[PDB]
Design an enzyme around this catalytic site. Structure first.
Site, PDB file in Angstrom:
ATOM      1  N   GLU A   1       0.833  -1.199   0.000  1.00 57.45           N
ATOM      2  CA  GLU A   1       0.000   0.000   0.000  1.00 57.45           C
ATOM      3  C   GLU A   1       0.874   1.258   0.000  1.00 57.45           C
ATOM      4  OE1 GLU A   1      -3.540  -0.456  -0.537  1.00 57.45           O
ATOM      5  OE2 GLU A   1      -2.466  -2.327  -1.036  1.00 57.45           O
ATOM      6  N   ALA A   2       1.990   1.218   0.726  1.00 60.92           N
ATOM      7  CA  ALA A   2       2.995   2.271   0.673  1.00 60.92           C
ATOM      8  C   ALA A   2       3.568   2.460  -0.735  1.00 60.92           C
ATOM      9  CB  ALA A   2       4.113   1.979   1.658  1.00 60.92           C
TER      10      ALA A   2
END
Ligand SMILES: *[C@@H]1O[C@H](CO)[C@@H](O[C@@H]2O[C@H](CO)[C@@H](O)[C@H](O)[C@H]2NC(C)=O)[C@H](O)[C@H]1NC(C)=O
Ligand SMILES: CC(=O)N[C@@H]1[C@@H](O[C@@H]2O[C@H](CO)[C@H](O)[C@H](O)[C@H]2O)[C@@H](O)[C@@H](CO)O[C@H]1O
Ligand SMILES: *[C@@H]1O[C@H](CO)[C@@H](O)[C@H](O[C@@H]2O[C@@H](C)[C@@H](O)[C@@H](O)[C@@H]2O)[C@H]1NC(C)=O
Ligand SMILES: CC(=O)N[C@@H]1[C@@H](O)[C@H](O)[C@@H](CO)O[C@H]1O
Lengths: 261, 247
Positions: B160-161
């Site tokens: 997600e980062a």
């Protein structure tokens, strides 16, 4: 997947000083002028985009009124443009007539200013946010060494300092005209140098200029498109307390920035 | 393999790892008007996985297989054992971790499925260096009670980062402040909408950059911001790559 081909979308359009594109008086006659106006819910600020490159309010089309620069942008009967290629909006929010190359421009900042078709110089007064949400976006701007841009010296300068949550001068208001404004003084804008001798980025009174128009690119730069340059940390050294405008290069990490909202 | 280790986990090394992960995922990407790379599609199964090594504070390492089409975990290896999500591509077990004892986890790699089996949501799962570290351990020994929350941690802190600079930056703040956090509405609204933002960005090519549908992205003050075009810096300077959606 018919969701790949949306047939239309109604939205607002905001620009200089966060004001909206508005059909003056909600008048519907051909040639009715468009102006800046404080943003609201009224129908004459609702612009419907279609895949024929028309942009419509009150059932009529946004259009330039002359080939030459300097004349009003208006709404007119759509059938008149049947053989016209319409508007093209650049990824940085320049709204351009495809045939004449004139762009939507607000020559003054005040409510009721007549919008005109002008030659593109990439000024902030020629930048627009197409979208329903018209408010400035409040953010920190993170750069080299994971530091934050901060308004300094009584809001006249700008450089990197260690990020401190809620430290007031580290917050910026991103406006619909691509300006980056001091969050607690929204008359002040991050500006590229007005002195030929200096590349130093500073904070000045908002004026609609090329110097104050900034694009947060997907490649992670903060670009001034009229000057074809980007924000950079002087000598890639945060301790010099100098942010400058430079040609884009991969040499250091000083041209990389993050919006943290 | 690209790797991130507990022993060398600074803001600088984390940022480089995420930058490199994005670069690897976007090899052969396509580009639209927005200039945001669109992940590969219809990738032959043999080339569909990018392997990444994570090493914890016991110096034990897991290798995760990331599907390059959607930037999701398909499976992982610990020593001579491997574990596949039940929605991993059906042929994946013939292509990755072949020389190991393969196991099927009885849940999907989606947040919704992981949260149902684990009985714990992202909002209640702390993120930070030591949770990254412990998640690797739990996966390494495959402690079934902690496998789901370990995936919640690692999916968010790695994948997600990579998808969102905002999320990357949340993790960076955590490292530097030495302070754990749980994702709030800002982070969850990004995770929730990655596929929808991909669709709207690509679809917007025919409508002068305007979306067919608005997406609500929350800010750090929990205010929803309507993103109904490509002209929002919170999207276009944030989302690092997109899911393939439109011809
Ligand atoms: C964009 O600009 C062009 C050129 O100024 C406009 O085209 C003119 O349209 C008017 C009214 O239909 C005609 O009378 C002229 O003959 C056209 N001029 C030329 C040279 O084509 C066009 O209408 C504008 N379109 C929009 C959407 O603004
Ligand atoms: C044509 C006219 O004056 N009618 C009034 C309305 O129109 C507004 O006009 C302003 C420009 O002064 C601006 O374009 C705005 O978007 C329009 O709503 C409005 O005043 C209405 C009450 O809201 O009354 C009409 O008389
Ligand atoms: C904005 O556009 C309209 C339509 O062309 C102009 O008539 C306006 O001119 C202004 O009003 C007229 C009646 C006259 O007083 C003129 O001298 C004014 O400038 C124009 N408005 C502005 C502010 O330029
Ligand atoms: C346990 C679980 O949630 N299973 C779902 C399954 O129902 C769905 O068909 C599949 C799609 O690939 O993803 C997973």
């Amino acid at each position: 997947n018919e969701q790949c081909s949306p047939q239309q979308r109604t939205t607002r359009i905001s620009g200089r000083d966060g004001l909206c594109v508005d059909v003056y008086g909600a008048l519907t006659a051909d040639g009715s002028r468009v102006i800046l106006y404080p943003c609201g819910q009224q129908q004459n600020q609702q612009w419907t985009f279609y895949p024929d490159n028309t942009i419509r309010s009150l059932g009529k089309c946004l259009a330039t009124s002359a080939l030459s620069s300097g004349s009003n942008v208006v709404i007119t009967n759509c059938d008149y443009l049947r053989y016209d290629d319409g508007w093209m909006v650049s990824s940085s929010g320049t709204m351009m007539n495809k045939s004449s190359h004139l762009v939507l421009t607000a020559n003054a900042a005040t409510s009721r200013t007549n919008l005109t078709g002008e030659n593109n110089v990439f000024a902030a007064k020629q930048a627009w946010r197409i979208g329903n949400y018209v408010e400035p976006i409040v953010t920190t701007i993170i750069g080299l060494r994971h530091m934050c841009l901060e308004a300094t010296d009584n809001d006249t300068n700008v450089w990197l300092e260690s990020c401190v949550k809620n430290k007031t001068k580290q917050y910026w208001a991103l406006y619909s005209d691509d300006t980056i404004r001091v969050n607690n003084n929204r008359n002040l804008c991050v500006s590229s140098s007005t002195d030929s001798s200096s590349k130093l980025i500073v904070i000045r009174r908002c004026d609609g200029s090329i110097n104050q128009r900034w694009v947060f690119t997907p490649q992670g730069t903060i670009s001034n498109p009229g000057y074809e340059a980007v924000m950079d940390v002087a000598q890639n050294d945060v301790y010099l307390k100098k942010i400058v405008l430079s040609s884009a290069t991969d040499k250091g990490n000083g041209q990389q920035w993050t919006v943290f909202y | 393999n690209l790797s991130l280790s507990q022993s060398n986990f600074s803001a600088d090394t984390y940022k480089s790892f995420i930058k490199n992960l994005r670069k690897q995922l976007t090899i052969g990407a396509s580009y639209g008007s927005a200039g945001i790379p669109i992940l590969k599609h219809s990738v032959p199964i043999c080339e569909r996985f990018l392997l990444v090594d994570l090493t914890n504070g016991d110096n034990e390492t897991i290798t995760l297989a990331i599907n390059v089409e959607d930037a999701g975990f398909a499976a992982y290896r610990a020593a001579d054992r491997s574990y596949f999500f039940q929605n991993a591509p059906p042929i994946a077990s013939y292509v990755i971790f072949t020389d190991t004892n393969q196991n099927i986890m009885n849940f999907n790699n989606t947040f919704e499925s992981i949260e149902i089996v684990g009985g714990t949501t992202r909002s209640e799962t702390p993120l930070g260096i030591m949770h990254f570290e412990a998640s690797i351990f739990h996966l390494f020994v495959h402690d079934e009670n902690y496998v789901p929350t370990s995936f919640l941690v690692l999916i968010q802190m790695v994948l997600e980062a990579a998808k969102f600079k905002f999320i990357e930056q949340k993790v960076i703040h955590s490292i530097m402040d030495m302070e754990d956090f749980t994702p709030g509405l800002a982070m969850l609204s990004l995770e929730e909408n990655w596929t929808q933002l991909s669709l709207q960005l690509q679809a917007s090519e025919s409508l002068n950059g305007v979306f067919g549908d608005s997406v609500s992205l929350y800010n750090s003050m929990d205010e929803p911001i309507g993103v109904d075009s490509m002209y929002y810096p919170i999207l276009t300077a944030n989302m690092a790559f997109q899911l393939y959606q439109c011809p």
